[PDB]
């Protein structure tokens with residue numbers, strides 16, 4: 001009977017553009033060519049379903065002492081890309097989890 | 109001014125063994141040998157450093173109504189695996205974040 005403190009939505013997605021590990025925005029190839037056959041590029045993306053499952057932020061948080069919200073953390077997936085017209089293999093930034101972050105309130 | 113609810117540790121790693129997408133334990137290659145160019149397989153994994161970063165469980169949790177602990181979640185990354193003579197690409201699992209899990213009482 002377990003709950004996560006923030007709700008997530010995971011799916012397989014394709015991207016046309018992404019941002020690599022170092023920051024460059026880069027075109028992500030529709031297809032890739034390995035072992036004389038073509039494959040599409042898919043990515044397992046996990047986003048936040050919303051930033052406040054509970055009206056007071058993350059779930060099960062002590063609201064009296066903590067303000068909170070849920071936001072995503074990234075992973076880095078190797079993919080075939082292109083910056084300008086130079087094609088290269090790079091690690092690109094895919095959202096991989098939905099995590100709660102807290103701000104010690106003495107104000108909000 | 110902000111804090112994580114559970115802490116995490118990330119690094120780029122090599123894998124000799126790995127759990128596949130269908131549940132099987134499989135062995136990852138040393139190198140991917142493309143066009144007579146060869147590349148090791150690097151994976152970005154994030155783990156928790158602590159199932160409970162605070163005595164109460166996860167940080168900021170209303171411990172009075174909720175029990176809590178932080179655990180890894182998995183992403184799915186294509187790696188080149190082998191069993192003996194037969195190499196194949198398969199989605200293996202990689203720990204990508206530390207999330208807080210809660211159980212006790214309220215719901216909503």
Ligand SMILES: CCCCCCCCCCCCCCCCCCCCCC(=O)O[C@@H](CO)COC(=O)CCCCCCCCCCCCC
Nearest residue numbers: 039040041042043078079089090120140147150186197198
């Ligand atoms: C069913 C079988 C079908 C297979 C087709 C796949 C379809 C799925 C979609 C996904 C597509 C991906 C396919 C992958 C195919 C592999 C091709 C091999 C080519 C190798 C080239 C390569 O490996 O890519 C490398 C560039 O050659 C990049 O490797 C890096 O140089 C090494 C790691 C360095 C990390 C540096 C960061 C340090 C910062 C500290 C950490 C803080 C972080 C914030």
